[PDB]
């Protein structure tokens, strides 16, 4: 019955400001408080500040004080939060919550950085690979923003021995990712490999075999 | 603002097994606590409210009690459903806070893992960048020290991991640690070493690559 609906995600430069949406449905939207938490990626829980619908009274957490708004639509069960001069602290899952029910939470990145399709670059089994009857093989999805990145291999008929790491932001603001396989060491004649990257926010679609070298 | 100290941060358990998860509140608040689940796909659910109050859509299997100015969330029996991160809430005053979370993850023997390097490629380095990729695979636990040596030299600051999540199938990890040089700069060095120490390995596995070689 209670549904909190929030936007997906939303990508905004330092400096800017970010106006979230949360949409309530199931209960009467005066009757209860709407709490805003913030959860930096692999972050605990930080309570913003709640707004009581019913009156406009709002309360806050004095770190946000400064720089957020809480602000209602009654006529359209939403809450809002605008949260201003964003910096990359910024950067962070927000969610609306009321007693007991919480948002699915919306993803906000704040970055300077512009849309960029990653090179891909070939891991390739060297030596330094091959574990005896297994090697590593991959690909590295460098410098590509903003994510995320889809990675298969042979079109998807490589499912086993596969490794796509989370993305990590490197300090030039865009992203680097790596797809990695580890297959048997005596298929790379046999076999080839190939990884699919598609980057659909830049719709750069890039197929890299990873090829053996073994000077 | 009143704390919440929730110990432990981090929890490795087998299924089956009884867990219990506290929060130790600064000052009284009355048993006006709740305890949120996490799932790995970012959902939060509360189980536990006013302390002690099984939420309708919460298993059984959970409960809460206090001991003064101790809220504990018990799993009577863990099921897989219940891997995930668990925070307690407290809602006595303002501002309101969360206590830190606990990570509940599977336990499983340790297993070390397979370490491979790989060299930048030359396709890379005609960017005036290289990247030297050491990668840990399917290991256990998550603990993992790893480092960057260029001509032994320890690298600092200049080198970024991830790790994935614990595969739904072996409950192992594995971790890829980038180390970022110039062109300039990975060409003024020969040996590119990653050495990796984690607790199935009795001794520090180092994996290498010349430059000046193959």
């Known amino acids: 019955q209670v549904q909190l609906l929030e936007p997906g995600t939303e990508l905004v430069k330092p400096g800017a400001s970010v106006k979230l949406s949360c949409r309530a449905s199931?209960?009467?939207?005066?009757?209860?408080?709407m709490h805003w938490v913030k959860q930096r990626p692999g972050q605990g829980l930080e309570w913003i500040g709640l707004?009581?619908?019913?009156?406009?009274?709002?309360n806050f957490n004095d770190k946000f004080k400064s720089r957020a708004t809480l602000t209602v639509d009654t006529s359209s069960s939403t809450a809002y939060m605008q949260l201003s001069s964003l910096t990359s602290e910024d950067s962070a899952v927000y969610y609306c919550?009321?007693?007991?029910?919480w948002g699915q939470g919306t993803l906000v990145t704040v970055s300077s950085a512009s849309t960029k399709g990653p090179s891909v670059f070939p891991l390739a089994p060297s030596s330094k690979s091959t574990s005896g009857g297994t090697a590593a093989l991959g690909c590295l999805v460098k410098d590509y923003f903003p994510e995320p990145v889809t990675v298969s291999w042979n079109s998807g008929a490589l499912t086993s021995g596969v490794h796509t790491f989370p993305a990590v932001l490197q300090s030039s603001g865009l992203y680097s990712l790596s797809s990695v396989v580890t297959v048997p060491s005596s298929s790379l004649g046999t076999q080839t490999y190939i990884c699919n990257v598609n980057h659909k926010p830049s719709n750069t679609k890039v197929d890299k075999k990873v090829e053996p070298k073994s000077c | 603002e009143i704390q919440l100290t929730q110990s432990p941060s981090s929890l490795s358990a087998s299924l089956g097994e009884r867990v219990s998860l506290t929060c130790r509140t600064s000052q009284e608040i009355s048993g006006y606590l709740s305890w949120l689940q996490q799932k790995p796909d970012g959902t939060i659910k509360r189980l536990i409210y006013?302390?002690?109050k099984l939420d309708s859509g919460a298993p059984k299997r959970f409960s809460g009690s206090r001991s003064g100015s101790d809220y504990s969330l018990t799993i009577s029996s863990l099921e897989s459903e219940d891997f995930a991160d668990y925070y307690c809430?407290?809602?006595?005053?303002?501002?309101?806070?969360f206590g830190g979370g606990t990570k509940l993850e599977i336990k499983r023997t340790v297993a070390a893992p397979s370490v491979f390097i790989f060299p930048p490629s030359d396709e890379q380095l005609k960017s005036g960048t290289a990247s030297v990729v050491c990668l840990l695979n399917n290991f256990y636990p998550r603990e993992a020290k790893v480092q960057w040596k260029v001509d032994n030299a320890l690298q600092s600051g200049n080198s970024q991991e991830s790790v994935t999540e614990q595969d739904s199938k072996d409950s192992t990890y594995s971790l890829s640690s980038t180390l970022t040089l110039s062109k300039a700069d990975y060409e003024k060095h020969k040996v590119y070493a990653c050495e990796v120490t984690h607790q199935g390995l009795s001794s520090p596995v180092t994996k290498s690559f010349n430059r000046g070689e193959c």
């Open positions: 199931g209960y009467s939207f005066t009757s209860y408080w």
């Open positions: 006013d302390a002690t």
């Open positions: 919550v009321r007693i007991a029910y």
């Open positions: 707004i009581d619908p019913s009156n406009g009274r709002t």
């Open positions: 809430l407290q809602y006595a005053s303002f501002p309101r806070t």
